[PDB]
Ligand binder design. Sequence first.
Ligand SMILES: [Mg+2]
Ligand SMILES: [Zn+2]
Ligand SMILES: [Zn+2]
Lengths: 107, 1462
Amino acid sequence: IFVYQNNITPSAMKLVPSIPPATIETFNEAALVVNITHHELVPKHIRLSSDEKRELLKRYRLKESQLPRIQRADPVALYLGLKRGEVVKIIRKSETSGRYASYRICM
Amino acid sequence: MDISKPVGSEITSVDFGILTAKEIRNLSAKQITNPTVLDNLGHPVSGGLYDLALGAFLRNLCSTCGLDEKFCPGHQGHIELPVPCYNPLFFNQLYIYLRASCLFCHHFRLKSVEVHRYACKLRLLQYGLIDESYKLDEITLSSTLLNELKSKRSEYVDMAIAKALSDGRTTERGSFTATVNDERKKLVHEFHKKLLSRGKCDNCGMFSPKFRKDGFTKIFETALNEKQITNNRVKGSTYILSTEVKNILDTVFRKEQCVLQYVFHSRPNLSRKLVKADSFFMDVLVVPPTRFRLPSKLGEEVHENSQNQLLSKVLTTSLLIRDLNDDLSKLQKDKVSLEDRRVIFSRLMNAFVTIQNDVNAFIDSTKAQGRVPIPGVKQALEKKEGLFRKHMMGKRVNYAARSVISPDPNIETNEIGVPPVFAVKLTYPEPVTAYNIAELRQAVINGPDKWPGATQIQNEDGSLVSLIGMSVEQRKALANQLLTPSSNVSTHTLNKKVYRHIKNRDVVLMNRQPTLHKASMMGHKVRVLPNEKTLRLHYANTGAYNADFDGDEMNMHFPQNENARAEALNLANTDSQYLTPTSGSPVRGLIQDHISAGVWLTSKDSFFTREQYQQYIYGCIRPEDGHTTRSKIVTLPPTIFKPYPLWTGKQIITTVLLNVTPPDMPGINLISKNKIKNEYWGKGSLENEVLFKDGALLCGILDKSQYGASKYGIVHSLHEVYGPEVAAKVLSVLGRLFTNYITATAFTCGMDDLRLTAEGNKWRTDILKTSVDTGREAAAEVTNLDKDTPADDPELLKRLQEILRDNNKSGILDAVTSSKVNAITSQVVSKCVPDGTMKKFPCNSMQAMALSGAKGSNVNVSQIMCLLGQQALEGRRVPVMVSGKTLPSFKPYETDAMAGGYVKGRFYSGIKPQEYYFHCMAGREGLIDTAVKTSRSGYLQRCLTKQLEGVHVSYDNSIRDADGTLVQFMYGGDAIDITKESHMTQFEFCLDNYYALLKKYNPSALIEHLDVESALKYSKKTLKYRKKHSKEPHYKQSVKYDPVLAKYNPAKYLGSVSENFQDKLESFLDKNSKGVNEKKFRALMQLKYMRSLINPGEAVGIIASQSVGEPSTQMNVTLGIPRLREIVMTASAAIKTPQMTLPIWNDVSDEQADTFCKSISKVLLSEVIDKVIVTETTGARSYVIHMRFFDNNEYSEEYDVSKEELQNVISNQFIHLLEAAIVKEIKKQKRVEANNNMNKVQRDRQSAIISHHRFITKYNFDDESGKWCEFKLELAADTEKLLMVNIVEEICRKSIIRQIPHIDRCVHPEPENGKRVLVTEGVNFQAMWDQEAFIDVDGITSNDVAAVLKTYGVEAARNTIVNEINNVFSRYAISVSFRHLDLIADMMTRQGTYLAFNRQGMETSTSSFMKMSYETTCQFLTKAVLDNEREQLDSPSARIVVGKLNNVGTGSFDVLAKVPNA
RNA sequence: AAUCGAGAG
DNA sequence: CATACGCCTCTCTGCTTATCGGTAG
DNA sequence: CTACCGATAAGCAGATCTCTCGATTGCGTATG
Ligand SMILES: [Mg+2]
Ligand SMILES: [Zn+2]
Ligand SMILES: [Zn+2]
């Protein structure tokens, strides 16, 4: 993680993907002032592991991409460090059914 | 269709493609030679447009097929045009590919490394690999380096595809979804943009000339540059022929075949066919058969087909250019008349232009040039009256009738009155069998006139015989030989079909346009009546169809196959739709006169003797017609025994229930109320509540609330306890009961019901005559002048005139005066009705039907008998003429309620002409508003339903569109059916009826084929887990335990239920008040939940679209359909009215809250300037700009702005904006006292100002009072006159003093339902995130959706969407289910972005037919043919296009047949 | 067959 | 004077496109 | 220095239920 204020150097932004599988994330202070996951409007997002993700896929007889998608630029993916292909798990406080658990893949 | 000629084969998909130029030549049965369509003698001409080779034509045997006009299907031919013509469909793609191409090296003017990168990415996306296509960009790290990059990237992509195919993430055909389609289109779009941006070709270094276009069929290029030629020379508006562009494109496409195969194939190309660039050019046209180009005789006039016209025009130009080529060879040998040779060569060029434009006209009418224009092929299938919508989505149909509807309360509520004329015309082919010959022989004997009868008899060989012109003995022979063995071997499994008339056995489809929701098209068992020629309909269905009898008519479709009969009889029949899935509220029930008769028969004052009681019961029931259950009518004990046996009306209702309700089943122990307050019946009355018990009525009265458009009634509970069938029979039986009753004791209304008493009139008159002072005081208060001032006051008149001129002031005045006169009206109504009427309820029949809900309302009664009241034009009183008069009679600027549209009259004693005029204005406005609102919701509903029309619950309880993509895992999170959730939370009723509910929720009959342990065990486990974790913020709570339905099948595992349901069930089981025990009650509630689940394949998307569109017919933040379409139809980030809700800390004061609001709210420079004075002096052209400021003590404490801050603003923003404005205007033009020296520091500031700015010469801002600020200004002498007022004003308005960005005010609204809130006129979350001392930043919820999406996440965006969509429905209290709205939100956030419901929001869908039928059929057709998309035939629209059984509902499964023998 | 006009719910 | 053959101006969304400069080769 | 590009207000393409009646259909000029 590299927290950057004001503006980062545009010449310096072309090196983050080039790195080997070891990633390098940057986060601005602008969204760092308030933890958005504490805001009760935003549901609590949680990661998923390979085994349970494969279990979900076998339960629903689906493809990777047929699931709903969450975008790589989503502010909560910036919080949770989601890679491309990590099925986030969201908890839906649905008024109709109290606690409900849904998903959105990150691709 | 016929049911005895099945079709072995069936279409399974369809893939678009380009018709190759040589296959048509191989295909074509004849070329098209000469334009002349027909010669004389009425004969076709060989080589014309009506050749016999193109199909049969008017008893001319087809020279290709040899059949006649009834059997020749047509045969395509081709016209060979010499010069290849641009295909107008793909002109933009042709331009894109021709441009950004280097004819020098025959490659794209782009680096081969980047081109190969894009090609590899696309070949990866073809198999659905989305992450691989992004990690491909990790290899970047000169010929050797570039070739190494190519080799490694291609090896990596091949390995990635091999891994995907081995694992199973793809097949040989490829993995294509909505997300993959989005990624592929995004990548292709960026690739085209990157390609059409470069300068000189980067693969060789050579420049290439540019191209241009004047539209379509208009191609041109350009010349090089003076420096470019030098670059080219050291490296080493001309017209372009169509064949030249083709020759350019052929080479480059042969070179880039790899990238072009990965662009022009969204699926992996199995056929490995090439991508030939001649596809963009139509070398040869196709002529549709004479069958599709026939003419018609409109009497004696015969019209030549427009397709023939355009094709003959194209062929005329073809013959022109061909015969012009004959004489171009004449000058070939004589190469000395080259000038005239160049003349005819320009003629040949213009003929090329003409033929290309002729083909452009033949395809797209608008792509022609010249200013009745003939429709083209694109125009023939483009729009609403095109082909897809007018002939594939909806078609005229056979065996369907139509007539005016009329009422008939003597048919069962699941029936319809079929006139005899239809019953002898509509038919149904009944294949004769040994169980039908008794009635089918009779139908054949009776023939086509005597119902029941038959019209045709279809023979075993499929041949037809007509009974229309036969004799009785002939038809007798036919009927006696009807069923007989067939000696023909081929048709040894077929039998005769008799086209019998429609009996009462069958079922029919009824539909009253417009079909706002699905309930407006149900099924009715037919009953044939020998009355007039009109359809007769029961009264309960008027609510479902929204139908009246004022001249209404509705289509009556007759299903012609057992599949459709069983469909309409079980899924769509009118009884199976008691409630609507909009909100789960009832939609059926008796309407007006049955209700008003119920208020009388169930009145406590009504008794009926033995004879009258028994007559009523028998007439209502008629056991011979099946209304009973005990094979003999049963009775009741009379209420009274001495002197003589009397009964009661409530006993009549009780025995009616007892006779319809099935025996050995407890009666409905119901507790509810109705629309009639206790004080109406007198002191000590308890009639407000009804107390049903054991199938007996014991208190209160029946009403609209217990049958009709009201919930929790007796018929609703009969529904909830015995299904919808018994409720339907109760509706029918009460319809026949209150009808025969109302004949004996009729119901009427008259002038006596509309009167008052002397005291009532006195009260009315006095409280009305207060209105003079009422209106004057409203005006005086609004104008802020002193109260109790005479109306003729000049200041009052002036203020009223200013208010009239200003729209907002007029609105404020109207609102205040309207509130006052509404207060006066309410006082009058309360004091008079019901305490003043000379005739009182229940005698006062008008008031009775207003109270009872049969018709009208308390408002209607009040304005008939007491006061018509203030008239509302839009949200105002009445438009006022510019002279200030509201009418000719009323004096200008009159302070008077009667002038301001407040009518004091009543319809009983008439209205004065001025009030008549105002009331006419208001009524006309209402009519216009209704006329607009009828059509406003049509586009909204159609747009929603075109996209949601496929989504349907999978057999895994998850809802997912027909392409497979998943929108939600549970419907609303609970899988609870909207219709079936009627009484899930009505535990008191459930307990009261447990013993009756058991007979349907039989455990011993529904326990074995289920698991009853695991779900309940895990449920208790998770329940205890959640209880133990107690209360903690949702981001802290663990997720070790999930909802039970997520892991356990809600339909296979008992006890797997929602979480709200469990909490409320335990809370109401905490009563501990009574056989029935908690275990049996719990088990029965859980079986109820198990049977209350949406069945798989339910058309949930259609249902939600209807539930969100149909209520929209009855429609400061935007409200109504505008808000709804803004949320869903457009998804506009430029939302008209954005706001954010800011909770404030409980430990703050109100005054501090206002201080913080004014600290945040935006202030502009113009807010604090009384007047700015400009002194244009030319003797160089000086401009003293002296600005007057408001009182410092006032504006400092109104805006929280200080002298120092204003000084900074003027010194930095305002002067510079003004200077830029002055200099820009000149650039475009060519085409109080003071002291001479404030102090030395002031003079240094002045010098700094002069140095900093360009043509300023003075400056000084009062720092001790903040009352003025001047700055002298000059320009040169060449400039003209300048306004120096409008520019100053606009710059002043733009320039800001203290603004939080994206916020333009912060008001303090009065708290509602607690939870104090500060709401602004903008959205900027970053701004208040810094301020936590006041705002509870953790709970800011804003009006916008894009803002919250990009600053908080997709799920916060979906929350905001549901909240906003419910909010607009919540101003009118049209409560729609929280499941439809969430389904809409998650369908419009299914790609991680805020998507709308329009053509832009459906681009990334696999079904091209859906988009083409929706709109812009051409553009979606190009996007499907060019990528060679294989339409998979799974969206409902595609099925309708091709003719395949829809998969939603009864098409979500298949049907087998267990044979008995090997 | 289109265009224009009258209307129905 | 019949008969026959062609030339001609009072909405809103969402994607065509901006002029210019920031800034590393 | 300048090309690569990243972003700045304007031109155009395409949107905005079912039904039953009736009336009428652009002209100019050339040969016999
Ligand atoms: Mg009607
Ligand atoms: Zn033929
Ligand atoms: Zn080149």
